[PDB]
């Protein structure tokens, strides 16, 4: 409703860097709000794409941002009669970024890894890796839970069980309010997908540079499966956390697997031990149900509600014809120990190939009416196909079925405006929560400030 589409703010990165692929708000130890931006194709030292991170201070006029520096050099360690190797070319540093307390986590899902032992090898595979920074102090740490030192022949002799070689850890990421980093790894266990959790404090205190293989004892990984419903399901394509079991001491995990069960797609809600509490199945094969997930209480009962995006959903139209437009599903959490029912609301896109539901961002209470609101991206939507973000207001019964406001992309064709979203943070301290929108195709980020309601 009351986001201002007249006076925007633009931050820009280097051409070709894909500045805006991921973003998040970041607060320093003094509460000052900045913007962390991932640019997964920023050039590195060898004039080669490795990715990069930028930490943008809040200025109404926007502009350029300083780099958040991470070690971009390939590493080698000869130890235990083996050779350990990291490969950072085209790793995609900045394909996901998240901020918690005064700490920034920025991941490279396609960092490769290999181990050599005489004439055998582990195989050079994308285990992924995440980088952690405390900007005010300069502290640095890393976390790569899928690096192993097992040789290729052992996996073959053991029928490829517990094969973490293609995790792509950091493909998605989230932090609990207690400080536990949770990583999505959609390629884990031979492309079933896995989750990796560890406390940020323990990640820092157990890391030292040059070790490459080290133990984070408090960590916790999910499990392999023999159930074919999970094969190639990409469990961990997206992640989120919320309160869904009525017990406030436990934190629950929300995991997207958009190709679960022969591309039907699914979303699962789990406890912190990866035990399955609920499962929400997709409506239509190949619609990518589970591409995005979001958790926020939209109907003011104080119980977290769930939203699922299926950007490739095909809507039925006249004369038995389908049109790909995208769809968003709303599930309201019921009172007490009960399972999530059918969706309370279905939101369906309008523009062909618009990919409505590619990103869903909670906004907090944008219009200050006592109900939290959401924003949905259609990165190729709008009548021009340039991209659109749509705002939906909460209400006692859920969400309004029609958008209160529509943000048309200010960028040229192909910017992917809305591919990443973030709200619920007041960046200018005017008392209204604001919204940042990434458009990596144009290497830019747009800031929409919320202003007082007109109506």
């Amino acid at each position, epitope marked *: 409703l009351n986001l201002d589409p007249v006076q925007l703010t633009f931050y820009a990165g280097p051409n070709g860097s894909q500045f805006g692929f991921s973003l998040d708000f970041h607060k320093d130890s003094h509460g000052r709000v900045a913007i962390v931006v991932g640019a997964p194709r920023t050039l590195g030292p060898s004039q080669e794409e490795t990715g990069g991170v930028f930490l943008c201070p809040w200025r109404a006029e926007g502009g350029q941002c300083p780099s958040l520096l991470f070690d971009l050099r390939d590493e080698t360690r000869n130890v*235990g*009669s083996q050779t350990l190797q990291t490969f950072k070319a085209r790793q995609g540093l900045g394909a996901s970024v998240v901020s918690w307390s005064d700490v920034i986590v920025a991941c490279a899902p396609w960092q490769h890894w290999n181990v050599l032992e005489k004439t055998e090898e582990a195989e050079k595979t994308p285990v992924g890796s995440c980088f952690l920074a405390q900007p005010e102090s300069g502290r640095r740490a890393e976390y790569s839970p899928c690096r192993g030192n097992t040789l290729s022949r052992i996996y073959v002799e053991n029928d490829f069980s517990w094969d973490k070689r293609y995790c792509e850890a950091g493909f998605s990421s989230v932090v609990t309010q207690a400080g536990e980093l949770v990583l999505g790894a959609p390629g884990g266990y031979y492309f079933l997908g896995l989750l990796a959790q560890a406390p940020v404090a323990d990640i820092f205190s157990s890391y030292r540079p*040059g*070790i490459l293989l*080290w*133990h984070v004892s408090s960590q916790s990984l999910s499990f392999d499966s023999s159930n074919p419903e999970y094969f190639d399901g990409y469990w961990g394509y997206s992640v989120a956390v919320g309160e869904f079991d009525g017990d406030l001491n436990t934190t629950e995990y929300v995991v997207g697997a958009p190709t679960w069960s022969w591309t039907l797609g699914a979303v699962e809600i789990l406890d912190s031990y990866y035990q399955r509490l609920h499962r929400l199945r997709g409506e239509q094969m190949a619609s990518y149900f589970g591409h995005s997930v979001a958790v926020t209480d939209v109907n003011g009962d104080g119980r977290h509600d769930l939203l699922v995006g299926a950007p490739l959903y095909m809507e039925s139209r006249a004369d038995r014809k389908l049109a790909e437009v995208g769809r968003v599903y709303l599930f309201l959490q019921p009172r007490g120990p009960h399972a999530l029912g059918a969706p309370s609301l279905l939101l369906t896109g309008t523009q062909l190939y618009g990919r409505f539901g590619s990103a869903i961002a909670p906004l907090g209470d944008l219009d200050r009416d006592g109900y939290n609101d959401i924003a949905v991206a259609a990165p190729y939507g709008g009548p021009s196909g340039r991209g659109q973000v749509l705002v939906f207001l909460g209400q006692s019964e859920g969400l309004r079925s029609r958008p209160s406001q529509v943000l048309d992309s200010p960028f040229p064709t192909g910017s992917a405006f809305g591919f990443s979203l973030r709200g619920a943070v007041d960046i200018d301290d005017n008392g209204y929560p604001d919204l940042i929108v990434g458009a990596y195709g144009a290497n830019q980020v747009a800031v929409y400030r919320a202003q007082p309601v007109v109506k």
Partner: antibody
Amino acid sequence: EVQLQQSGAELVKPGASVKLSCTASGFNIKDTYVHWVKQRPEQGLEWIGRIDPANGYTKYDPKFQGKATITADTSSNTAYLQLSSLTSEDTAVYYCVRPLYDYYAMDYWGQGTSVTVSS
Amino acid sequence: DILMTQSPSSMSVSLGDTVSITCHASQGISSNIGWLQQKPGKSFMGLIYYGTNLVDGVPSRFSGSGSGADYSLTISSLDSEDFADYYCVQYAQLPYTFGGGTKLEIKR
């Protein structure tokens, strides 16, 4: 807190066999490698070998091949060192070791188990 | 197998002194070395791993340095508990191999 409690002092005869144990406390024995080290006053410290209790794969110094066998039971959180065809040279104190953070280090040690071979 | 020549086998020193123990390898080990302490009649405690990194709980008066095949352990301002046996161990290659040890004894 990580603690490695080993079995009591052993006292056996030449030619017999003995099986020492190393029970993990405060953690899961499955977490890291578990090594076995032999100490004598004259010969010093000798690395026997290691085991990955997760999968059971073992490595050995070729000096101990056939004499020492390293096993582990994740169910009982314990690792074992079995010595056969015992002789007077096998009389020593034996330690189990695991690393702290580095996968290959030797940081945490058990209190040791004394073995004496005598007719 | 990699030989670890540790020196000296013993030193007679005093409280508050700054002493150093070296360890020489028959080939390069690229900081894959740990340092160990054994108090009299007791078991082992880890001090250093990967050349320079203190084990959790170890005071900072202990430090390790070196590169290639030559490494050192320094104890600034000796303490009454610091009189014990010290050993190096390399893990650059299997089998792991140890040094001969070093006993710090009280001078009088």
